[PDB]
């Protein structure tokens, strides 16, 4: 499956793509403002994620740090990034179908649109100014708007037991972005696409 990753932000982002235990394609790359990077994701990929990282520094070997979404200091991500990270999430070729969503469960850093480039389903978007509107207690000093589980580490926010409900903090993400997951047990906003669809992830889709 192809995923065209486009940076429409006025700032550079370092795109990342991983399934948690391995990179997807090269795993990461710098995207200056306006740049497009097309990756190939193996059919059958389950639990894949794409995200942006901001304010990165990498040396010649691809080692360094990002202020948001850092994946163990690597340019080429092999693991998930450090919150806050707006997430484009996907599972492909799952009994003949693809499943996509945007999630704020690990916070928000950069606005994003995640849409198919092929027929048969709609895209999902979280493009509101969540960083600007972020509640004081969730603001990440390193940049971004943290989720409440990251900040407070309680069973209720982290949905440790599976009993959790919505919270004042999850409702903030849900109000700004109704089409993204705001907590672990949120009412799903996952879209079913034909199996083997192709996609485009656009950072800062509106500006």
Residue numbers in the entry: 1 to 207
What does the paper say about this structure?
Therefore, we set out to perform similar experiments using conventional single crystals mounted with standard cryoloops for three protein targets (EP, Thau and 3CLpro). Cryo2RT was also applied to Thau and 3CLpro cryoloop crystals, yielding high-quality data sets after the cooling/thawing process. In this study, we systematically observed a slightly lower resolution for crystals collected at RT compared with cryo temperature, even though the same dose of a few hundred kilograys was used.
